[PDB]
Amino acid sequence: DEDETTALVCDNGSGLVKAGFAGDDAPRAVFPSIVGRPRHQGVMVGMGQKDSYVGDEAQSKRGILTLKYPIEHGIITNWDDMEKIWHHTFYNELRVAPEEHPTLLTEAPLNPKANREKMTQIMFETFNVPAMYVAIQAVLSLYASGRTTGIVLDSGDGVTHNVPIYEGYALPHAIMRLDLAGRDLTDYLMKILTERGYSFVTTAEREIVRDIKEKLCYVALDFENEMATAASSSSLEKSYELPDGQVITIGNERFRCPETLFQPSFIGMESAGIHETTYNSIMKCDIDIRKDLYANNVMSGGTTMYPGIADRMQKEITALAPSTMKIKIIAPPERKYSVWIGGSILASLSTFQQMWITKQEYDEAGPSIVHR
Amino acid sequence: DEDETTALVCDNGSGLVKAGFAGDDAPRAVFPSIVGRPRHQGVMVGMGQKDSYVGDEAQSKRGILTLKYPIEHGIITNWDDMEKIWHHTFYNELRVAPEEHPTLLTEAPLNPKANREKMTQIMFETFNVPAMYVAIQAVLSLYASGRTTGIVLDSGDGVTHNVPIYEGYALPHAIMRLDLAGRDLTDYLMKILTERGYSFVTTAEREIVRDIKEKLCYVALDFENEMATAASSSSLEKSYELPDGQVITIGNERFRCPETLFQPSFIGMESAGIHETTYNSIMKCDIDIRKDLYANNVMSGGTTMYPGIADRMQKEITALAPSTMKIKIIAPPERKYSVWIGGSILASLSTFQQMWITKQEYDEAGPSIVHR
Amino acid sequence: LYNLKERYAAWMIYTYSGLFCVTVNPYKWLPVYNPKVVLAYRGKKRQEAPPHIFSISDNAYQFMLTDRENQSILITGESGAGKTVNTKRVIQYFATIAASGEKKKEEQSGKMQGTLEDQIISANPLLEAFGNAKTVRNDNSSRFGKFIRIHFGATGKLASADIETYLLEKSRVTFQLPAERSYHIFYQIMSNKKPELIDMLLITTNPYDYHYVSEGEITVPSIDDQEELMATDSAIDILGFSADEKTAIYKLTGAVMHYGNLKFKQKQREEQAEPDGTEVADKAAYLMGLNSAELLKALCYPRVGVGNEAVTKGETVSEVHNSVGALAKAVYEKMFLWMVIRINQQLDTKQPRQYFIGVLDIAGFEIFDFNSFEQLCINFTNEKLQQFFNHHMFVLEQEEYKKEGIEWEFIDFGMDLAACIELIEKPMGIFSILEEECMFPKATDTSFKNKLYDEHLGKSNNFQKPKPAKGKAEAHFSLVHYAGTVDYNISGWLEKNKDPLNETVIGLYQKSSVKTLALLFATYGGEAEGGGGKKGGKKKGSSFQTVSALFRENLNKLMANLRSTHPHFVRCIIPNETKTPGAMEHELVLHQLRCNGVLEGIRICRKGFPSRVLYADFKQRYRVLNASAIPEGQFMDSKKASE
Q: Myosin motor domain: which residues (chain C)?
């Protein structure tokens, strides 16, 4: 129990932090990855002067603060502001003292060696956690779907990745990163919806375009004869009621937004798209492992939640793969937390105890120890 | 007690001064904002030659003096004559010595920086008050209705304003000023009542048109089919008995006077009206704060006291606002003193002590100190 | 720790620790308060006699006439330390050793109403019935603080007295912990020694009929409610109260019981409160000189005044029950205050006064896992009191090194605490932020909280964010007091600090047939002018703006009175939670010592020249060393001697 209860799992994202206790089924804490700094001197009624704001209080009060994102494209870019988000996570969100809890953290696919050593330096030397561990994100997603070999298409708020994993070892030279994700996708909907003849003028109009994207957006299979369908004008249309009455209608654009993930050309991107990239990762891997990867395309991440994403991907890679092959696109329902759940499982596991980096290992080996 | 008893609250208006002690429920002193200067040399029986007259003695003796209004449209226009009204307030009306009383004063919505510094220069350097503070008027009105975010429609004797306030900070760029108020409104009644076939000939006829406006005037909802009602001639009519017998009847015009506040066109004004202006203030503010402002339209000022003002405004902005919105027009009964009461509360408060500008701050920082 | 302990196991309760006069609860009887002792300690410096309270108390007197300065005695300790006992005992002392009403001295209804020396005394037993109760620690715990000014004459004979009350435990009136009980009075009255009372008040003799007063315990073996009732009764009289008033008091004390019996129910299809009967209201109404109806309306349909008018507001069941309770408490309090005033009034004589001796009885810094508003107020009081000492000592010390000719320079010892005090009492400090927000019609505890931080956090050292775990219950803010770190919970503060009362009802009181009740409310009725419309400032009309606004004012008026005084200190101690004579838990006594000031006086002593002997205390004990030449020195000049 000492640490069975006690292991923490913190998944640091570009848009959201997911956090909680190893053992739980889902994150106890989910909140924006921002750190707000007040543009002016003054106070809220009853509070003192605050130097900084994090998560939702930074989002809610955004009009008087300069908002900053510590993690650009999955990599920690500002370490002063990240130690601020961690502090908030332990002390306010989970309300635990960190110096008696083992902490499993996550990093990104080709996270620079030096960063994995730096967050270890900050975990052990400024938070004084007993022990910690850094798992790679795609690797926890795979594992949370039971398996050990597969290829994960991972897509969240600032990055998309393909991480081919074989008997647990993520394959460095076959990993692909595509910098277009849910953030890019909300801003494109924004324009095709103002372009539908609308105005997201106040900040209460801006924010909810993102809630339109999440609730009403679709990834149609045969996106071709779906536009064609749009035109005959079926009961395909969908009206959403705004903060007030102002019933906005979205028929068609509803799927023009996730067609951006297959066609980056919709947004002036010259890069290849999700399905081709799944494939290219795969023809960059060893030959003998390619049947395995093809029958185990695990999807994780908030942006892979658009319904019919899996069917489109299913047919997208069948028709690029040699017919002798078995294609299989696994997309679980909890996928917006796969990464986290994979960490919860792993860290609550009976056999993981012997991989925890302890302060004994650290004080004796330097940050190098956990770096592997 | 030193200053718990001792804080003064002086609300300077275009028509009236409201004054008294922080702590009280209502102003100890209310009187016209005039300064009379005798047109001829001579005396009243038993008095000496008087150079000047202020408040009610200036009104009562108006036939031999040239009356002057120091505050034009809420802004202090003559500083020689204002120091005269302040002097009168402290020494004669409240009969206090100012050099041992902290003084909370009020200013108008976009009061020029230089004025807030000038009345501070006069408070500290010619009245020698221990400490003082200048609150913005709409902001005290809001606060006296308990809240901190809302939009105040403030309307008195020379100005009308809309001041959107968010967690206490009045929003400069969304404030609207409409120069038509109770003064304009008494003169319009005057004409529709002489136009009813009457004569307000002597000064005892002039003054009481204003007491007709206050007692008998109404703001009808559906001002349309209220004129229509007037015609069928119901028992809608209302006769007032003059200083003498001369029973004057006012049926209809009774509401044609406050319909001027929604239709400025009744008086050759091309500006928009109260309800549209409430609204325009609101579509000039941030988007995310517009649901707050809509559910918190606080009314203050002598001219917002016309019964049924709130119902007309209620329906005036519901029907301009998106139906998804909650409208809420708060109009308290003490509203002709909201501003003052908000100051009484605030200045008698336990936490306000640390915002008082003291002579220590001033003698050391210059007028800049209180200016903020 | 060890010295105290040893002389206790030997049954010596009075040991000095510098200037202090430590006192340990015997938990049994002692011939110390002995009428022989009283004399013995009469005219003796504390070096001519062993450690004892009369030493302090006599010296004060001495000093009083010798130096022509006023004096003070500061008694302080935890709930079970037994201060009242001392306080009282000190008081008798004064009365005895300097009375002489000449005519009042005879054995003819001696000490009955009609003399002060008695009034002076009789005072206690009234206050005690109303401001005292069975605590889980004491059986007669003081639930309030107090300050008496014994105004001595020119000659040196008694002339006047002056009481002042601080921080009364209003909550007992409505609540009570399981092992505790409410004020005595209630139980006194229902005891049945004066049966008329029962019928007069319209109550029963079974407390379980009055929820407000039987939530905890009803009977205490060591107390004879029947005897006290008279004590109380008789005291009132002596105190000069009018029968009527003496009738108001009673009648008023029963109304309050009744209130807690007032019941309500939800109006059908409405969320409104509607009276669940006019059985009790009737009694409460009559007893207060009210009208049942008018009363139940005001209660149910509170008619407010938002804007420039008076808007009738409807309340919920939960809202009523709570408002009632608020008046119950409000009324009791006020009354209590009044009684004190009335007492003071009798204790007012025309004879001249040249000096006084102040006897202050209040609580000491107590730390709980749960520290709320009330704790701050008390702690703050103590942290002040402490600085008050540290200074007196600095002043004092420095005289010696000046008298002797030593060369020692040092900074005021008070200074160390100024940091904490400013943070609380200064303008942008806690109280202010607390009392400002109270002006915001739509503020939250949460609101208040943030304001507290944004402004003090990171910028102030004594200011800190809590340590939520250990024996503590939640988080908000810790302070760094001299005694240590106190973790404060801010929840209810805003309210508690606003003293919200249904003004409609108060209205009724204000026009009662029961003058006294009418009186008690006057000061509320006279400030309403000032807070006429919604929002604003109550102070405009003389109404309190803060729960804390006075406390401060009173605490200032006090600490000022304390200054024009020659401070004399007394620290009361509590041996063991278990109530056993001759015993002591260590850490329990250790605690007190830190929060007492005792350990801080030792510190300041040790900076330096630790042990410091008072001259007579020096003569006596050591004359024998060069017997001839040291005795001559000590006798020839109390000081020059030791030299």
A: 1-643
Experimental method of this PDB entry = cryo-EM
| SS3 at position A155 | strand
Q: How far apart are CA C124 and CA C122, in angstroms?
A: 5
Choose the closest CB to A46 out of C449, C458, C469. Answer: C449
d(CA C133, CA C80) in angstroms, rounded, equals 12
> How far is the C-alpha of B339 from the C-alpha of B139, rounded, in Å?
8
Domains of chain B: 4-34+71-134+337-371 (3.30.420.40), 35-68 (2.30.36.70), 136-181+271-332 (3.30.420.40), 182-267 (3.90.640.10)
Of B351, B141, B214, nearest in space to C533 by CA: B141
Contact across the interface for B332 and C530, Cβ inside 8 Å? no
The total of other beta-carbon atoms located within 10 Å of residue C235's CB is 25
d(CA C359, CA C561): 11
Q: What phi, psi does C37 have (nearest 5°)?
A: -60, -45
CB of C622 closer than 8 Å to CB of C414: no
Count CB neighbours of A288 within 10 A: 7
The answer to whether the Cβ–Cβ distance between A48 and C451 falls below 8 Å is yes
Where residue A100 falls (left for φ over 0; alpha for ψ -120 to 50; beta otherwise) is alpha
Smallest Cα distance from A70 to chain B, Å:
25
Whole-angstrom CA distances from C26 to B73, B74, C35, C84, C87 are 77, 74, 18, 14, 16
Looking only at the bridges linking them, the beta strands covering C264-266 and C273-275 are antiparallel
Q: Rounded to the nearest 5°, which phi and psi values hold at C425?
A: -85, -20
Check CB contact under 8 Å for B291 and A245.
Answer: no
Max Cα-Cα span within chain A: 71
3-class secondary structure per residue, A97-121: CHHHCCEEEEECCCCCHHHHHHHHH
Spatial distance between the Cα atoms of C230 and C235, rounded to a whole number of angstroms? 8
* Gap between the Cα atoms of C123 and C164, Å rounded: 12
Length of chain A: 372
Residues of C assigned a catalytic role: 79-80, 84, 138, 141-142, 364, 366
- C-beta separation of C181 from C212 below 8 A: no
Chain C residues near residue A43 by CB distance under 8 angstroms:
450-451, 454-455
Name the β-bridge partners of B12: B17
Nearest to A81 by CA among A132, A130, A155, A12: A12
- Which of A268, A220, A215 minimizes the C-alpha distance to A242? A215
Please name the member of C452, C456, C459 whose beta carbon is closest to the beta carbon of A46.
Answer: C452
CA distance C13 to C7: 7
3-state secondary structure of C97: helix
Q: Do B287 and A202 touch (CB under 8 A)?
A: yes
CB contact under 8 A, B25 and C531: yes
Contacts of A243 in chain B (CB under 8 A): 291, 324-325
Burial C110-144, CB ≥16 within 10 A → b, else e: ebebebbbbbbbbbbbbbbbbbbbbbbbbbbbbbb
User: Alpha-carbon distance A254 to A240, whole Å?
Assistant: 11
Measured in angstroms, the CA of A30 and the nearest CA of chain C are apart by 22
Which of residues 418 through 447 in chain C touch A, CB cutoff 8 A?
433, 437, 440, 443-447
Element (H, E) at C358: strand C355-363
Amino acid at B347: A
Best C313, C439, C448, C503 member to test B by mutation, with max B CBs in 10 Å, is: C439
Spatial contact of C510 and C519, defined as CB atoms under 8 Å apart: no
Q: How far is CA A120 from the centre of its chain?
A: 21
- Pick from C308, C451, C538: CB nearest B333: C308
CA dist A105 and C286 (Å) reads: 71
